[PDB]
Structure 1
Amino acid sequence: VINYVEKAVNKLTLQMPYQLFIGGEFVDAEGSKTYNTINPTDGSVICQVSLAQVSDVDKAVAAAKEAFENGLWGKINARDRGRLLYRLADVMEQHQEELATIEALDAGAVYTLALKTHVGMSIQTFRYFAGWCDKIQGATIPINQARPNRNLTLTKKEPVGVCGIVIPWNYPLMMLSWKTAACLAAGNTVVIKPAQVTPLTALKFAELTLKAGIPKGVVNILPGSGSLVGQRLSDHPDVRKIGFTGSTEVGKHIMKSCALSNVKKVSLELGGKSPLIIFADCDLNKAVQMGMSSVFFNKGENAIAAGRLFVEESIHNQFVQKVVEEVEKMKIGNPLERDTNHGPQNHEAHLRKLVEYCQRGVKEGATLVCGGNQVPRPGFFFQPTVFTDVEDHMYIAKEESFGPIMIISRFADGDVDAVLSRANATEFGLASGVFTRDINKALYVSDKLQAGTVFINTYNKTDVAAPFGGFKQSGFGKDLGEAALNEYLRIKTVTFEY
């Protein structure tokens, strides 16, 4: 029997585990230490959650090690590993409303969006990678023959072993799911560190692995701090790969920590300052809808959010007027209410950061067209914000806000290479977008953009089959698609002479 925090909300009863998940059981942290998780809608404490200590990390890694080396997970057919992950996705679907509601409470996710994206895409992710298990294939290779003898050379794709996954707070279940589904499908075992501020869906997911019959120790979850828990995962001699999503500065530190311990493999999904280039020959009303979406989706807490919009001179003013018209129609409120389409920011410190970010924008000479402030109501709501007259040297032209802040610059009519240059003048390179009806411009622009994803006449169109990853200081390695598996597999070459 598991201890839950119980809550009647959104026409259901939430049953939320709040403890560490180690070796298939929910347990207190060392010293029974706890911390509070905070509801961003009203600022209240949802509940106390166990605070993992170093010895808890070591227990989790040891359970993952044992599950990998001696447990059933390392012994079953790849097909049967697939079946378990497809069952896990089924169980998640059976609990979809509950997961989405927990995500609304914990992260401020608008419930209707959480159901479709945070949760819906997580379910798709497990089903997708479950199908990869018995389709992961090595090669046979026509090497030169040591005559008069013969040679056969094959490769075997094997699991990397014990993995550590460290994730951010913006889509807690979804980021967990993207990386965990690939990690498990490849036959690995894992210790997961959710962001300290958003532990709840991770711990509920942990319970769901029990319902799905995932063997004990295959999945371990440690709410706790990056500087303590995340650090120990990166340092651990028995961890063989870290999958990381978060800030560029933390990613640098993780990669360093991987190097200094045992050269564990690492993948990094880092920040973004993604440019969206909107040409005069686009469909304007549709550009407004998708442009707003590119920024405001999930209250801007989205690594691929367009952090910079370049709008062609002749449509700029009309674009801005229409955006302001639409912004005014947005319903800001409780993420659980059906009319809400803009929820609170994830946590208080992040709201403060956004208020300061916009002050700096104003101070440096950008035009604040609307928003810029906290919404005067309980919780941590921030106004959808539009800046114009943004110049390339400005702080807000360079820094990732990670909030609902549209940052608009003009470019001259007929210019193409000039705007590309400005769009590429960043050490980030996660995503980018272009709106145009012109086939030649679209294809040329997608070639020239220095970003791991280019959207054409859409934005935020991620898919579980489409690889997602950055260039330059946005990191390396892919989440999603077949390519994600390569971060969680090793290749063994076997060469016979006969």
Structure 2
Amino acid sequence: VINYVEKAVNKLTLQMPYQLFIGGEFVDAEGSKTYNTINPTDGSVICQVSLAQVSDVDKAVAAAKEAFENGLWGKINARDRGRLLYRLADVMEQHQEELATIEALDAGAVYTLALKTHVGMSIQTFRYFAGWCDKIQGATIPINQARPNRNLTLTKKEPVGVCGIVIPWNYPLMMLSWKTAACLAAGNTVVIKPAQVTPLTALKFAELTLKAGIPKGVVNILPGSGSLVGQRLSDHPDVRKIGFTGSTEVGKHIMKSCALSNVKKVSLQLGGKSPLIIFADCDLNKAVQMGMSSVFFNKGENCIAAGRLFVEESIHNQFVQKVVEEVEKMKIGNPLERDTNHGPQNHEAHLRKLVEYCQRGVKEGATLVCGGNQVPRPGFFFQPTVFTDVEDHMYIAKEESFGPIMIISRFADGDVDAVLSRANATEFGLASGVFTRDINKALYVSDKLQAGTVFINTYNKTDVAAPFGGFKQSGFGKDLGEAALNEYLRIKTVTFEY
């Protein structure tokens, strides 16, 4: 029996584990160290959570190693590993309300959204990748023959081994699912580091793996400090692969030392300043709706949020007038209340950064059309914001806010290449989008944008089957789609002469 933090809310009784999950058991950190996790709706402490130490990281890795090398996970059929992942998906669905509620408490996710997306997308992700298990195939290859002898060459796809994955705070459960599911479907075992500010749905997910029958050690979770746990994973001889999503700083401060020692594969997702180019011949009202969703979705804590919007001169003023009208209707409130459209930011440090961000936008000469401030009310809410007359040299044309700030620049009519070049000046290349009814423009702009995802006449449309990952300083490597499996597999070539 597991210790919980029990809590009655949203007409449920939550049972929330708060310890490290190592080797199939919930256990305290070395010397029972803990830290507090904070509810962004009111500022209150939700509970105390184990704060993993170096020696705990060693234990998790050992447990993952033993589970990979000698445990059942490495001995069962691919089809059966698939069943167990599809069973974990079902357990997650049986608990969806509870997970969406913990996500609402821990991360400030509006509850109706957390059920459909934070939780809804996680379940699709395990189900999708469970179905890959017995469909991962190698090749037989028609090589030149060592006459008068014959040759056969075949490749076997095999698991890489123990993986260390670091999860960001913006969709704690969903981002955990994205990495973990492909990694696990490929046959690996894993040590997961949830972001310090958001451990709780991760720890509940751990308990759910016990309910699903996932062997002890295949999943291990270490809440605590990022630099401490990330660094030790990066340096560990037994960890073969590091999946990192996070900030550039931050970040490859303690994870530069990864390929740079005992060798390991690395995947990296590091940020974006995604452009969204809206042409005059788009469907204006739709562009306002998708345009807003591109920025405000999930309180802007959205790794692919449109970071700049370029809006063609002749529709600019009308576009802004409409966005303002729609912004006025958004309902800011507690993520549990069903009428809420816009929830609190994830934690206080990040709220403070957004307030600074907008002070700076104003200072450097952008027009603040609305918001820009903390909402007067308890917790960490921030007012949906709109800036116009943004120029390419401004800090806010380059820095990623990671919050609900719409940053709008004009471009002249008929000026495709010029706006592409401005749209491409960012050192990032995670996502991008274009709204236009015109086929020729849509396809040309999608070739020319230097980003890993291009949305056309839509935005935020991710899918568990569609690979997602950046170019340039956004990193490299894909989550989601068949393409994600390859980061978590190695190829063995076997060549016979006979």
Change (3 A) 1:180 1:103: same
Conserved? CA contact 2:157–2:492, under 8 Å = yes
- For the Cα contact (< 8 Å) 1:188–1:488, is it kept in 2? yes
Report if aligned partners of 1:270, 1:473 keep a CA contact under 8 Å in 2: yes
Relative to structure 1, the CA distance from residue 156 to residue 251 in structure 2 (aligned partners, 3 Å threshold; closer, same or farther) is farther
Q: Deviations over 1:78-112 (max 9, x none)?
A: 00000000000000000000000000000000000
Work out the CA distance in 2 between the residues paired with 1:253 and 1:69: 31
- How do 1:5-404 residues align onto structure 2 when only pairs under 5 Å count? 5-253=5-253, 255-404=255-404
Any idea what the Cα deviations from partners look like across 1:377-427, whole Å, max 9, x if unmatched?
A: 000000000000000000000000000000000000011000000000011
Distance 1:422 1:445 in 2: 13
CA distance in 1, matches of 2:147, 2:427: 52
Residue aligned with 2:351, SS: helix
* Aligned residues of 2:230 and 2:255 also touching (Cα < 8 A): no
Deviates more, 1:142-151 or 1:465-474: 142-151
SS in 2 for 1:468: coil
Which residue pairs with 1:455 in the alignment? Answer: 455
Deviation at 1:226, TM superposition (A): 1.1
Measure, in 1, the Cα distance between the counterparts of 2:8 and 2:310: 46
**C-alpha offsets along residues 289-322 of structure 1, whole Å, 9 cap, x if unaligned?**
0000000000000010000000000000000000
SS of 2:260's equivalent in the other structure is helix
How many Å separate the matches in 2 of 1:395 and 1:113? 31
C-alpha contact (below 8 Å) 2:231/2:255 kept by paired residues: no
Deviation at 1:212, TM superposition (A): 0.1
| Mapped contact 2:259–2:266 kept (Cα < 8 A) | no
SS of aligned partner of 1:118: coil
SS at match of 1:209: helix
Deviations 1:223-253, CA, capped at 9 Å, x for gaps: 0111111110111010000011111233433
8 Å CA contact 1:301, 1:404 repeated in 2: yes
Contact 1:91 1:208 in 2 (8 A): yes
Give the Cα–Cα distance (whole angstroms) in 2 for the partners of residues 396 and 250 of structure 1: 20
Whether the 8 Å CA contact 1:273–1:306 is kept in 2: the answer is yes
For residues 255 and 486 of structure 2, the distance between their equivalents in structure 1, rounded to whole angstroms, comes to 18
CA contact (8 A) 2:247 2:270 kept: yes
How many residue pairs match? The answer is 498
How far did residue 472 of structure 1 move?
A: 0.4
8 A contact 1:160–1:489 mirrored in 2? yes
Q: Aligned-pair distance for 1:260?
A: 2.6
SS of equivalent residue, structure 2 residue 190 = strand
User: Shift of the alpha carbon at 1:338?
Assistant: 0.3
Q: CA deviation at 1:255?
A: 4.8
Do the aligned residues in 2 keep the contact of 1:160 with 1:488 (CA within 8 Å)? yes
| TM norm structure 1 | 0.99
Contact 1:67–1:218 at 8 Å: present in 2 too?
yes
Q: Conserved in 2, the CA contact under 8 Å of 1:307 and 1:406? A: yes
Distance 2:371 2:298 in 1: 17
Q: Within 2, Cα distance between the matches of 1:385 and 1:402?
A: 12
- Report Cα offsets for 1:16-52 as digits up to 9, x if no partner: 0000000000000000000000000000000000000
Inter-partner Cα distance in structure 2 for 1:489 and 1:58: 23
Kept after mapping to 2: 8 A contact 1:236/1:261: no
Q: Contact 1:452–1:469 (CA<8 Å) still a contact in 2?
A: yes
Give 1:133 deviation, angstroms.
Answer: 0.1
Contact 1:435 1:456 in 2 (8 A): yes
Look up the match of 2:413: 413
Kindly provide the CA deviation profile for residues 350-399 of structure 1, in whole angstroms up to 9, marking residues without a partner as x.
00000000000000000000000000000000000000000000000000
Structure 1 distance, partners of 2:382, 2:492, is 51
CA distance in 2, matches of 1:464, 1:207: 24
**1:131/1:188 CA distance change after superposition, 3 Å:** same
Q: Give the direction of change, closer, same or farther, for the CA distance of 1:393–1:105 in structure 2 (3 Å limit).
A: same
Name the SS of the counterpart of 1:254 in structure 2: coil
Q: Report if the CA contact (8 A) 1:391-1:397 is conserved.
A: yes
| Identity across the alignment (%) | 100
> Following the alignment from structure 2 to structure 1, what is the Cα–Cα distance between the partners of residues 332 and 445?
35
* Cα distance in 1 for residues equivalent to 2:395 and 2:482: 37
Q: CA deviation at 1:135?
A: 0.2
Q: Take 2:419 and 2:263, find their aligned partners in 1: how far apart are those partners?
A: 40
- Give the deviation of 1:146 after TM superposition: 1.1
Tell me, in whole angstroms, the C-alpha distance in 1 between the residues paired with 2:221 and 2:252: 23
**2:269–2:475 contact (8 Å) kept in structure 1:** yes
Q: Distance in 1 between matches of 2:312 and 2:245?
A: 34
Query: Which segments of 5 or more consecutive residues in structure 1 lack a partner in the other structure?
Result: none
Contact 1:255 1:266 in 2 (8 A): no
Contact 1:122/1:173 (<8 A) preserved: yes
Q: CA deviation at 1:147?
A: 1.2
Listed one character per residue, the Cα deviations across residues 41-76 of structure 1 (whole Å, up to 9, x for unaligned) are 000000000000000000000000000000000000
- Kept in 1, the 8 Å contact 2:332–2:343? The answer is yes
Q: TM-score, normalised by structure 2?
A: 0.99
Q: Distance in 2 between matches of 1:55 and 1:246?
A: 24
C-alpha change, 1:177 and 1:497, in structure 2 (3 Å) is same
CA contact (8 A) 1:275 1:307 kept: yes
CA contact 1:251–1:268 (8 Å) conserved in 2: no
- The answer on whether the counterparts of 2:227 and 2:254 sit within 8 Å (CA) in structure 1 is no
Can you give the 5+ residue segments of structure 2 that lack an aligned partner in the other structure? none
RMSD value, Cα: 0.7
Q: Which moved more, 1:261-270 or 1:234-243?
A: 261-270
User: 3-state SS of the aligned residue for 1:42?
Assistant: coil
Tell me, yes or no, if the aligned pair for 1:335 and 1:344 is still in contact at 8 Å.
yes
Contact 2:37 2:106 in 1 (8 A): yes
Give, in angstroms, the shift of residue 213 of structure 1: 0.1
Could you give the per-residue CA deviations for residues 198-236 of structure 1, whole angstroms, max 9, x where no partner exists?
000000000000000000000000001111111101110
Contact 1:33 1:51 in 2 (8 A): yes
Q: Please identify runs of 4+ aligned residues in structure 1 that moved more than 6 A.
A: none
Give the drift of 1:150.
1.0
- How much has 1:263 moved relative to structure 2? 1.6
- Superposition deviation, residue 431 in structure 1: 0.1
Residue-by-residue CA offset, 1:431-457 (whole Å, 9 max, x unaligned) = 000000000000000000000000000
Work out the CA distance in 2 between the residues paired with 1:266 and 1:136.
21
* SS of the residue 1:277 aligns to: strand
